[PDB]
Design an enzyme around this catalytic site. Structure first.
Site, PDB file in Angstrom:
ATOM      1  N   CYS A 113      32.233  33.264  43.690  1.00  0.00           N
ATOM      2  CA  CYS A 113      32.835  34.569  43.255  1.00  0.00           C
ATOM      3  C   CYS A 113      32.070  35.209  42.215  1.00  0.00           C
ATOM      4  CB  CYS A 113      34.189  34.354  42.672  1.00  0.00           C
ATOM      5  SG  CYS A 113      34.298  33.161  41.188  1.00  0.00           S
ATOM      6  N   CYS A 141      34.333  37.484  40.538  1.00  0.00           N
ATOM      7  CA  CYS A 141      34.359  36.871  39.190  1.00  0.00           C
ATOM      8  C   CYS A 141      33.382  37.109  38.097  1.00  0.00           C
ATOM      9  CB  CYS A 141      35.109  35.369  39.447  1.00  0.00           C
ATOM     10  SG  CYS A 141      33.759  34.077  39.526  1.00  0.00           S
TER      11      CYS A 141
END
Ligand SMILES: COCCO[C@H]1CC[C@H](Nc2cc(=O)n(C)c3ccc(-c4c[n+]([C@@H]5O[C@H](COP(=O)(O)OP(=O)(O)OC[C@H]6O[C@@H](n7cnc8c(N)ncnc87)[C@H](O)[C@@H]6O)[C@@H](O)[C@H]5O)cs4)cc23)CC1
Ligand SMILES: COCCO[C@H]1CC[C@H](Nc2cc(=O)n(C)c3ccc(-c4c[n+]([C@@H]5O[C@H](COP(=O)(O)OP(=O)(O)OC[C@H]6O[C@@H](n7cnc8c(N)ncnc87)[C@H](O)[C@@H]6O)[C@@H](O)[C@H]5O)cs4)cc23)CC1
Lengths: 237, 237
Positions: free
Chosen positions: B75, B157
């Protein structure tokens, strides 16, 4: 989103009763149109969009309705308009001579209404109807107005007048119904001149010099139709 | 127009065979994804849009396909991009570390293809498919990319990078897939920073001062995510 979730308002409450009542009242203002069976008119209107997907409507869907609402208005007494609905209609309500599309039976029937079908049923969708921009262009309302505005423009002759809002940033908008359907369907054999009335909202300028007005002139000229433009400085008077 | 007449190109010739072959080849570049049954993947893809009206597709239509093409990519190694497709993909083809959406199985499958169904049949429409702007927004292709781009953005992320074309008039376009779906689905709990790489096309300016870049910063800041911006002056080097 879920299936048949549209962004626009649902079908106008009591739309069937409203269209029928409007047809009845129109038949009375206009003894010329008393040959119209209003229940037949409504059936044809309903038939144009019921059970059809509201993103896949065709001009042919409205052809039965166009036939029943056929109306002869003097082709030399047409008033087109763009973004100045109030004054345009107050103008023809005084004149009573000149006709906007809303002064015809079909325009009168639909004016300020919205409608669409719940696809795969015979029911009217009262929850939401497609928005032309955000959802789909070939929806029952947009296709209706495209088709009747084209036929209205096709029927005009001699000098066609268009009322335009001079207080706007785009006095002429090539993307409006007037700019994108009506102006391109004026027939040069029937129409000698398109005359624009640019209504001022205090602007002493000659708004016939506006670049969008010159853009309109270029479109009209390329269709072998003459162009004329007038400033209307005191809409009140 | 006639029924189901769309403005966009029809389904890519040999689309079923192409998607299957692409799934097969992806399973080989990526041993992580060999658990994927490519015939099952294709069946789910076909099931998302076949027999459904191509103006009425839903995100849920693609949910079976999302499940079969579930793929974990780091991520913190996501590369979003807007209007600089070539360089973005050459970048990740070198890095091999970072992933654009086209480097995932589902993005790889669909990249540069178009598809849609002939409604009320089980057949693929090879004649035309809805154009997002001119025809309808909820078409099989647009809905696919909206759904997978949202899920890609939701999965990012840490520091999310976005490559942008500095030689454009709208370096950041709020209406692009990046501006209208991806940036608003970055999760502030997972994402600390959105970092824009503005690629120059010779412009010595600090393009991080561009008004659309400041517009992007304002959107990002209002989501409680930090913003970072870098000029890339020599894309070659
Ligand atoms: C390459 O192919 C492109 C051709 O695609 C066309 C583009 C236009 C679209 N027509 C409508 C769509 C629609 O969804 N609804 C609800 C309408 C409601 C009433 C009417 C009426 C037209 N007329 C005649 O045309 C002139 C006036 O019309 P203007 O548009 O010039 O003046 P304006 O003040 O700006 O609009 C007035 C209202 O119409 C809405 N309005 C316009 N444009 C829209 C659009 N694109 N989307 C959604 N709303 C649109 C606007 O929100 C206002 O409620 C006059 O001379 C009439 O004779 C009298 S009523 C039309 C529509 C059909 C498809
Ligand atoms: C309020 O609700 C509004 C939300 O409505 C959204 C708006 C976007 C729309 N998406 C597509 C529609 C579409 O019909 N087709 C054929 C696509 C094909 C490939 C892709 C891809 C997206 N991505 C990820 O997103 C970023 C790049 O995408 P960008 O758009 O930012 O960069 P750009 O170079 O400008 O586009 C690239 C291609 O996509 C076409 N393209 C874009 N925008 C379109 C539109 N509005 N209409 C028709 N074509 C549109 C454009 O013609 C180019 O062929 C990346 O970070 C990817 O991770 C990788 S491929 C998307 C679409 C879905 C619905």
């Amino acid at each position: 989103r879920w299936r048949q979730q549209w962004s626009g308002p649902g079908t106008t409450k009591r739309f069937p009763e409203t269209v029928l009542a409007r047809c009845v009242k129109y038949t009375e203002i206009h003894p010329e149109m008393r040959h119209v069976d209003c229940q037949s008119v409504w059936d044809a209107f309903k038939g144009a969009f019921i059970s059809k997907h509201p993103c896949d409507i065709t001009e042919e869907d409205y052809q039965p309705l166009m036939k029943l609402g056929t109306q002869t208005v003097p082709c030399n007494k047409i008033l087109l308009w763009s973004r100045i609905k109030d004054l345009a209609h107050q103008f023809t309500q005084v004149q009573r001579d000149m006709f906007t599309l809303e002064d015809t039976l079909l325009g009168y029937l639909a004016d300020d209404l919205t409608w669409c079908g719940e696809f795969a049923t015979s029911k009217i969708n009262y929850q939401s109807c497609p928005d032309w921009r955000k959802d789909c262009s070939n929806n029952p309302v947009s296709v209706f107005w495209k088709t009747v505005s084209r036929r209205f423009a096709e029927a005009a002759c001699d000098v066609v007048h268009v009322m335009l809002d001079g207080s706007r940033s785009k006095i002429f908008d090539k993307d409006s119904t007037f700019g994108s359907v009506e102006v391109h369907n004026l027939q040069p054999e029937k129409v000698q001149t398109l005359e624009a009335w640019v209504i001022h909202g205090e602007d002493s300028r000659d708004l016939c010099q506006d670049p969008t007005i010159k853009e309109l002139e270029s479109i009209i000229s390329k269709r072998n139709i003459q162009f004329s433009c007038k400033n209307i400085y005191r809409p009140d008077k």
